[PDB]
Structures are given as C-alpha cells and as structure tokens.
Subunit: 205 residues, 8 copies
C-alpha cells in the first residue's frame, strides 16, 4: 500500500474531492485535556492513505480543517466519539456530518457483543487486520515503518464497512435511528469536552 506521510498538514485537497473520507487519530491517551493529538490519518477509500504527523502545540492545519468543515463530505470514523472530541479540542472545529461504524455495529450486529474494529473487519470483509502487539510513543519525531503501516491500516477499510452497514441498516429498517444517532454524536463529543465524559446523560441514574 502507498502511505503518504506529511508534516503538519496536507499540501492540498487534490486527492479529496470526494463524497466521504475515512478519518482516524492517534494520541498520547484517552483524556483530551492531558494527552495531545499526535497523528491524523485520512483515506479516500482507495489503496492509499495520508498520515499527518501533528507537532506539539500546533493549533492550526488549514487544509485538514477545510476537509473537516465541508458539510458536503461525510467523515467516517470508528468510535468517532473520541476522534471528534480530540479533533475539536485541538483545532477548534467540530465536524457535523459523520458516520460511526461502532454505532452501526451496535445497531445491526445484534448477534454479538464484540464491536471492535478487528472483529468487524474479520466478520464483514474476511480481511485480517493485525493489531499492534505493543503500544508506542506516537509523539516520536520519526515514526517507525510499523507505526506508519498500523496508522494507515486503521483507515483503509472504513468505506467498505460503511457500504455494508448501510445495506444492513436498510434491510432491517433502522436507517432513521442511525441517522438520529449520527446527528447527536458531535454533541455527545462536546459533552465529553465540557466535563460529562463519565456520565450517560440519558440514564435514570
């Protein structure tokens, strides 16, 4: 696979005049206020991916942010609740046209309790994703080849998954449910940033 590695931002949007872009992030941890965004991955759904290393203290990435803001382009995530939070905290823009394969999995793969990306890719595409056998310092000045391949591998399959999940949501007549969930997901992320990350706001207690 071809993986293009960039510093700071995309050079241009020539490769992203499309209807949907797959998006993922890597960080130093699960807490956006402590653990900075380190790498952002994008894919057009073809056999290539873009991996953008983000510098410490970087507040802007103009081309990427133009992609994130374009209402005409659906951003595909796996568990977008986190990626939306860290992206909004880092660059100040919250995407509002999104698709999340984890919510879709919870709405369609009702015969299992395993909704991780590895299990989804294995079941839906017969593609074997190999997951890192160790964690690493994503803030390293120079990423290893294994890191680059793993980061690109996290976005290469989201288009095919979205297509399959759209077929399943149509078959079982749950399209409007998913649509409402996706509409609320950015605000769920905002609730996380504001301090309710450990609270199910809709629960009785």
């Amino acid at each position: 696979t071809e993986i293009r590695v960039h510093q700071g931002d995309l050079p241009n949007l020539d490769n992203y005049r499309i209807d949907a872009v797959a998006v993922d992030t890597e960080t130093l941890g699960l807490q956006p206020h402590r653990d900075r965004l380190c790498v952002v991955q994008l894919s057009s759904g073809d056999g290539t991916a873009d991996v953008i290393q983000i510098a410490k203290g970087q507040k802007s990435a103009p081309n990427l942010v133009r992609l994130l803001s374009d209402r005409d382009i659906t951003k595909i995530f796996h568990f977008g609740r986190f990626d939306l939070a860290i992206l909004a905290h880092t660059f100040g823009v919250m995407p509002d046209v999104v698709f999340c394969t984890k919510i879709a999995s919870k709405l369609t793969r009702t015969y299992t309790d395993r909704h991780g990306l590895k299990e989804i890719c294995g079941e839906l595409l017969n593609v074997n994703i190999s997951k890192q056998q160790q964690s690493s310092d994503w803030a390293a000045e120079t990423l290893s080849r294994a890191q680059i391949e793993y980061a690109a591998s996290d976005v290469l399959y989201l288009h095919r998954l979205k297509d399959i999940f759209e077929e399943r949501l149509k078959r079982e007549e749950r399209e409007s449910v998913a649509k409402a969930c996706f509409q609320f997901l950015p605000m769920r992320a905002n609730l996380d940033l504001l301090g309710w990350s450990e609270i199910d706001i809709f629960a009785h207690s």
Copy 2:
C-alpha cells in the same frame, strides 16, 4: 387544588390554548411491552390539573393526541425518556418538541448527584412534595382522592422548574447543549421501544 378527572380523553382543548403543557403518565410498571398505561396527567401551569384515566386496550384519544402532536406546544416532562416511550407505544404518536427537567438538572445542578423531582422541587421552589408511602393499583376502576391528588402533584410545578432551569442554562451558557439533548430524547425513547432500553448506544463498552 382543582383536579378534573376524565374518562378516556379530554372533552376539548379549550383549556390548552397555551405555549407549553406539562405531561406525566402512570403505568403498571417500567416495561412498556408488559405494563399498560393507566393514567395521563396534564397541567396548563395555572395551578389546576387534568387527570385522564386510560381504559385497558384503549387505542385512541384524539384530543389528547392532537395536543401531543402539536409542534407549537412544548411538552414538559420529568424524565421524559419513559413517558415518551409509553405514550408512543400506546397512542402511536411520538412527540418531538419536549423539555425534560431531569436532563436540565443534570446539566445545571452539577453540585449534587440527587436529581429526583421531589428534591428539585424542594431546592428550587421550597415546596414540599409528599410522596406515596406505598404503591397502588393505578388500574383500579375508581381512583381514590389520595391517588388523584398524588397524580396531580407530579405536574403542578413543572412550568416553574422549566423557567428556573432556563435561567440556569442561560447563566452557565449550556443552552445549545440542552437543546440538542432534548432534540435527541425522542429517538432515545424510540431506541428503548425497539429493544435497546438497557444499552448506552454511545458507550465504548
């Protein structure tokens, strides 16, 4: 306290030419598929209430349902997640313009973990609500006077709470958060009806 008790439906909406109506329900239990709707309470905020007994197997209540469907009238609930579910299950109409005092409490009364209606009314209005010392047969053919007064007490104060909560949401600058939560609440209730009542659809696990 004037409490008007009706069988089946309101006679008309002459008392409900207003911008917001407080709504509550009573049932035989927490599971809409097993436990039928027994009582619906309404208040215009003028210190009076309407208590409508719903018959077993009743499928229609055109005047009440006309009120519930009117998008120009905000329906105020406390923990509307349940009431919306049972109302939609019973009458086939899902309200889509709502305000929930429990979500508002969780978004504003951040200094406590106790969000029940009795406590909210106590703190915000210095009004003492006396709650039943046991449960009762809400399906009884004739409700007792104590039952009627208890049922009306659940709607008499929701307008005043909504006014106060709106002041607090404005003060802490969380109005758009609450608006998005209320917009999603009917779909959360629908998700409950469809079989996800025990699942936080946005959680990682």
Copy 3:
C-alpha cells in the same frame, strides 16, 4: 383473636372441613437439614388460628399430615418454596395442591420490587402487621404470648390475599401462568431438598 396452642398435633379436623387452609412454619433457621421445624400454624380464614408446637425428633403428626395430603384442599402459603421443603423433610409428605402469595405478587404487583408479606398486607388490605423487633428461639418449651400472637399474624390474612390475587390474575389474564407456577412449586421445593437450593435450574449460567 382466639389462638389455640397445641402440642404435637391437632386433636381433630372438626375445624378444617374447608376448601382452603392457610399454612406457615417457624424453624431454627433456613437450612432444613440442620434447622428443625418448631411450629406449624393453620387458619380456616374465620379469624382464628391454630398454633401447633412440634417436638424435637417428632416424626409423625397424623391429623396435620391428613390435611397436608388432602388433594381437595388448597394449601395457601407466603413463599411456600421454603415451607413445602421443611414440611416434606420433617413429615415425609409433600403437598401437591398449593397457592403461593409471593409468586402471585410477582405476577401481578409488577409496579413494585417489594413482595414481602408486610407490604402486601399494608397495600392490599390496609392491615398493619407488626414484625418482631428482635428474634426468638421458637424451640422454647413454652412460647410467650407475644411470640404466639406474632406467629398467628402470619396466617390470619392469607385467604383474603388469595381472593384479591385471584381477582388480579383474572384481570391481567395470567391465570394459566400462575397455575403452572403453582404446579411446579412442590418440585422446586424437592429440588431444594435434593441439593439444588442455590441453583436456578432454568438459568443459562
């Protein structure tokens, strides 16, 4: 109330030529293999009760056992799962025509999670049962008056409860469910005696 106290057995069945008898027991504890039966209580529903003190090592109680065996008389219990076990373990006869107010409560009082006898009697009859504020031996040669009255209070109201629960079971269309539960209850007690007292035999795990 007149409470007649007997040693070992009823003198005769002159007071029990009836269709239903209320039954309760008092033991040295919850484990029938260790904790012996001490008292058996009966009521015809006429507001009087018989309290039969059972001696240590007693193997027979012929008049009582004739009552327990008579298929034309329904035995009413509250949580008969236990009483059936201790009676069968002590006298060798398992009743097979029974009614249990706890199962009936779980099938009809779906609006609460409190199914104890005190709450049922309070909510269904407005009768205040006063429960012992301390424990007792019950193996005492001579029971106190307070002890005798506390024991009688457990059988004095079961007929009225059975009548009301039968009305509710008919109303909610659960008569055949209750009948099957009562038909299985003696075997559930037998399973307890055989060693499965801590196992839900129908659970997946």
Copy 4:
C-alpha cells in the same frame, strides 16, 4: 454428511415418522421481540439433517408446525428455554413435549460447571464440535457451506445425548425431577415472552 437446505418449510414429513426429533434454531440475537428467527434445524438422529431458512415476516410453516405440535413426538433441545420462546413467538404454537439436554446436564453432570453443548459432546461422546469462526449473518439470502455445516452440527448428536442422559437419570434416581422440569419448561419460555425473562420467578429476591 447430507444436509438438505430449504426455504420456508419442509417439502413433506416423509423423514419424520419417528418418536423424537432434534430441533435447534438460529436467530439474529437473544431478544425474540427484536431479533427474528432465521434458521430451523431438524434431525431424525441419523447422519443427515434438515436446515430450513425462514423468510423475514414469515408467519406460517405448516409441515414443520405439525411436527412441533405432535404430542407423540418428543422435541429434543439444548437450552430449549430459548428455542421454545422464539418458535412460539414466530409461529404461534408452543411445543409441550420436550427434552432439554442442558437441564439434564445440570441434573446429572454435578461434577462440572461447564454445561455447554461442546463440552457435553466432548466428554460424553468423544466427539469434537468445532464452533463458529465468527458470528456470521444468519439472515443472509444464501448461507455459506461453513454456516450450513455449523447449523447441522447442532442437531446431529442430540439423540445420542438424550439416550445417555436418560440412563444416568435412572441410575441416579432423578427421572421424576427431570420429567417435572421438562413439563414446566414451556411455561418458563412463555414467561420469557411475557416480560419476565430477567426474573427467577421462584427466588426469594
């Protein structure tokens, strides 16, 4: 291994003029109100099995349903509590002559806590059951060969297990216990359909 795959129903009952039939199901999940019946598997106890694909919204399967309601034919299940529930919900007929290998295991294999079908077949028959390599889409229009073979494997051994268990139920003198449990099992499944699926109806709490 001959596996005949059908859509909707058996062509005839020529293969099922027998005293007992092994039955299993596959669904979209564990909740009958949400997750539809997708496959029914049958076996005569021979080296072949019948796999019947059930269409979405299908209300009738007359030849199969005649088999399910034939009181002269024992239906053998593993954990029939579920299969009975989904079958009764889908076709409106509750079988009432059943044998469950999981209840039998809990009554006889008291030296282990693993009562799943794989462990039982391994210990009792030295047969190696290979389980699904993923939780596939049982609602697929065309089942894969792996799916068909896995579905058949669930019924091929239930006759031999039923035979062995009935020797250890007579050896350990538990025949009447097992018979009563099997007689109650359809009502346990009905209770599941009515809304008590999470409730041990016989427990103290």
Copy 5:
C-alpha cells in the same frame, strides 16, 4: 454499680478466686502491631467490674497476667480472636482456656445473622446495652465517667450469657464442636499476630 478504676495492674487477686472471669480490652484500633492496648476490663460475674488503665509501653502486669495464665480459670470473651491477640502482643502470654460468646452465638443462634453483643444481650436477657455514640480516645490520661461506665458495661453480662449458651449447646448437641473451636481459638489469634489476619487458613482458596 461499682466500677473500680486502676492504673497499671490489679492490686491483688482477692476478688478473683473464681472459676471463670469475663475479659475485654480497648485499644487505639484494630491492628495490634500499630494500636496499643489502653484498657483491660474484668468481671467476676457479680455486680461490679474492674477497669485497668495500661500505660504506653507497659510490658508487665503481673497480677492480671497471673490471672490470664491460670489454667483453672476460664477466660470469657466476646470475639476473643482480637482480645487474645492484643493481650499476647502486649504482655507476652497467650491464654489457653477460653470461651467466646461469638462462636457460641454462631453455633446456636442459627435463626439470625446478627451476632454482636448488643443483639445477643437484648434477645437472651432482655437487657438493653446502650453503646457510645462516638468513638473516643481510650489513651486519654483521665477516662470520663461515661467512658468508664461503657467499658465496664462490656463485661458485666458475659457470665450469664455463658450459662445460657452452654444450655443451648447441650440442647442442640454441639458441645464437642464448640469445645474444639474454643481449644483452637488461641492458635487462630497467633496466626493473626504472625501475619495471616486476612486469610481463612482452612479455605479452599
């Protein structure tokens, strides 16, 4: 009631020419290695008690310790597991003739799960023990009168309890079990001193 308060040790054993003595202690906490012995209380079973203040770092109390080591005198404790440990840690002598009302309660009062001294005295002697409403500094140079009376109240009733528990142990044919438990109790206390305070040494895991 007469309470004699002493510094360091009894002046003599003139009041303790008896076959059994009730013993209790007070400390700065539950961990003998950190929390020193502050008070020891004794009673002959009559209407008076002796309360002995132990100084910080005190290693010897010859008259009291003489009493503790006299094998012709049974030492009565409530939950002697603790008192034996702290006494041996402080004075270097482990009593080996003991009676514990907590073990006796667990072996006889099988109809309850509350085995504390207050509950025992109330049920077996209709005596109301009033327990201090706030812990206090038992190491204070001068004990208050209320403190002294509480400390004495903890030993005044143990003889009467021992007599009743012995009657019950004979009645229920558990004398040899209880005797063997009391014989083992000092070694359980030694195990506590050696570092096994959180381990049931007889448990499977």
Copy 6:
C-alpha cells in the same frame, strides 16, 4: 458569629497579621475544570469569619492571593487536596505551607473510619455542626443568611482542631510523617489538576 461578606477580595490584611489562617472554598462541583469557584471563607481563629463571594470569570484577588502565597502563614484546610486544586486553578497560585485536618485525623484517629469534619468536631470539641441538607446554588448573586452561616461554620473551628491534632501527633510520635504528607499535599493537588485525579500514583495498580 460576626460574618463579614465581601465581593472579590478582602479590603486589606489588617485582620490577618497572624501565624495561621483557616481556609475553605465553595464551588459548583467536584471538577475544577468545569465547576467554578464561588465562595472563599477565611478565619483568624477568632469568633468572626470573612466570606468573600467570587464572581464568574474573576482572575485576580490580590489581597487573598497575598495571604495564600505567604510562606510565613500556615493555611489550615479540611481535605485541602480539593481547595488547593481549585484555588490554584482559579488564581494561579498554589499554596505551599499547609496543614490538613483530614490527613491528621487519618494519622491519629485510627480507631474510626469516619473522618469528616462534622464527626471530628463532635468528638474533639463537643461542637455540633448542622449541615444544610439542602445543597444550594452557591453562585447566586445574593447569598441567604443560612448560606452565610453554613459557609462560616466550616472555618470557625479549624485552629482548635489543629492544636489538638498537633498534640496527638506529638503523643504518638508521628510528627515527621505528618510533615512529609503536608509537604507533598500541594503536589498531589497539582497532579489532580494535570489529569491524574482518579489515579493513586503510588499504587501498584
């Protein structure tokens, strides 16, 4: 007591030329990043207290911060872990000469597990603190008299507690332990602000 209420800051430090000042805060909740500081309370150890209401968005309080920064003045807190965190978050200055009555209680009152201020004041001083039991909105523009009295009550007694705790720490030879804990406490609060508030940094796991 005389309680002087101020907006924003002390007028001067004329009342605080002292060696130790008692400090407490009130906020909108437990999470410093979400819940703003609303009230700061101070006491010289006399019979009066100062209550300074802090406005939304206030960044500066020069007289208060002079007191908080003065290394020659010990700041007495109860559970200073929180107050230090919120003070440093609000005004940008972390006090570094502190005494915490809760740590001292945990180091000296080893005979109890209840270390709250009400219980400590009750035991050590025989002073009854009455708690609001209401939990009001401390950000209100005008505080009620009850709010002012409750807020002052939290600082009026800390000097007397500090004196007693110092006596006990000397008696049990734990002075250097307390000194080390107090020296680390500001860094524990900083760790809370940085994102480790739910992590015991010294735990094995």
Copy 7:
C-alpha cells in the same frame, strides 16, 4: 506405575504396615450429602498406588476403615477438609491424625498465591502432573486406564511433599502452628458436614 484396582475394600493391609499413608478420594461432586464417594486412592509412598472402587450404597469397608482409624498412622491429604468430610459421611469414621499439604503450603509458600497440587508438585519436585482435560463419570462400572492413572497420580507424590513441607516448617519455625491447624482440621470437616460449610466460624462477619 503399578496400580492395583480393587472392588469394595483392600484384600488385606500387608502393604500398609507403615507410619504414613497418602489418601485421596473422587466423588460425583463437591456436596457430600448429594454426591456419593466413588473411588479411594491409597499409597505407601513407593512407586505403586491402590485404587478402590466404592459401590453405590456401600456402608462399610473394613480394611480401609482399619487404616483410617489407626492413630499410629498419619493420613496425608491435599485439601483434607473435603476428603475427611466425604470419608466420614460414607463410612462413619473421622480420621484424627492427618497432614494436609494445602495448609502446609499456605503456611510456607508465602511467595505465591497458587497452592494447588499441580503448582506445588511442579515447583517442589520438578514433576509435571497432567490433569484431566475433561471431567469424567467416576461412577462408571469400568474405569479407563487413563482415568485410573489420573487417580493414581494424586497420591504418588504426597510423601515427598510432606517431607519437604516439614523441613520448611522447621526452617521458618512454624511447626506448632501447623500441628494445631492439623489438629483442628477434622473438626472443620465435621462443621462442614453439620451445615456450616459456607461459614468461616472464626471470622468477625
């Protein structure tokens, strides 16, 4: 591995004129009142073992019981708490001179939390025990060779373990602790038979 299999009893005691015998049992489960004794294994400590099949309903085994009753012969068990209980329940004799390798392990192998026989034999002897990969029917008329060998492996190594544990107990000066524990172990087993199997009789709660 000479293994002699017998029916009912040893033919004689010619192989057991020794000072310590390794003993183990197999049953149909963990509950002696429900699960009968099926096999008894004995070893003189040499390279051979005796495996005695016990018949259903068998009440006597005179030669075995002669061995179990002999006070001059130490019975070595691993987790003798169970074996003593089932032996006493089956044959009516409680051994009173015992050694348990699990208690010894808990008193000496303080550097691990795994006290099972496999771990002990592996660490202390470098002997690899391969345990049953599936439970089995120990009541089978004919045991398989693999089954018999598994049964023999449980007694073949206990003498060597006892020798090592006694040396280690001497090294850490815990001989009298172990002796007292072994003396109490038969009464712990009796307590299990009487109904306290789930209770640590020495715990505070």
Copy 8:
C-alpha cells in the same frame, strides 16, 4: 553476562564509584514484618550485576548500607515503594535519593495501563525478558543458575530506562512532578512499615 554472587555483603565499593546504582530485592513475600529479605541485586549500569545472599537474622551489611546511605548516589528501583520498605526494615536505613521507573512510567506512558517492568523493557528497548514459570524459594542456601540469572536480569536495564524516562519527562514537562513524587516515595514506604500499607493517605475515602 557476569554475575558476582556474595555472602552477606559486598567486599568493597570498588565497582560502585558511580553517580547512580540500580537496586532490587527478593524476599519470601510481600509483607516485610513476616517475610524476610533473602537476596539483594545491584548494578553499576554496565553489563554486570552483583547478587548478594542475605542470611536469616542478619542485621548489618556495612558496605551495602554505606552505599544505600550515600546521598550523592541515586538508587534506581522499579516499584521502589516495596524495596525501600524491606531494606529499611531489615537494615535500619531508609534511602532518600531514589528514582522509580514505575512512577515514571505512570507519568509518561499514559497510553497504556500496563506499567510492569516486562512491558516497559519490551516497549522501550525491544529486549525480551523471560520470567520464571512460577516463583521460587529465594531462601535456599545455594541459588540455582536460573535463579541467579533471573535475579540479575531485573537490575541490568534500569539505567537505560532511567535515561529514557528522564528524556520523556523533560519532553512532556513533568520533571518537577516526578521530582516531588520521588521525594515523597521514601515516606510512602515508611507509612507502609508503620501500618498504613492498605491506605491511600490522600484519598477522600
């Protein structure tokens, strides 16, 4: 590798004229009051290590203790909380210049919750340490070759880890936090020795 094994103490400090020494211990268990220190491992950070066997009852090791006391030499531990406790308990000297790789990991490796030495060495150095298959008797008079190699492997890499963690702490600007944690760590160990080993002294509860 070169591993020098000594009895009692180092002969001299000729190999330890360095700024920092890696230190680890092995014991008979986790409780210093019960489980004696058995082995001490030292490294200069080069490819060799010293392994010192400590005798039972040994109170002094002058050269080792001289090293531990020298404030110009930083002692590197992994989870030094334990080693500091056991060293001070055994030799009476509490080191006060320390670096702990577990605290450093918890302050920098925020992207994982697994902070054990094996994981750290695997991630940071790509060195695979193979750990024993169980624990072992570290009190043996003669250690095995496998024991000696396993013990040396625990100190051989701490210098390289300290260098990497120090670079990361500078990078993420947490140097002063780490320094304060390390300054408090010896007092945390002292708190463990004094009896607060199970208590987070800074927690609210």
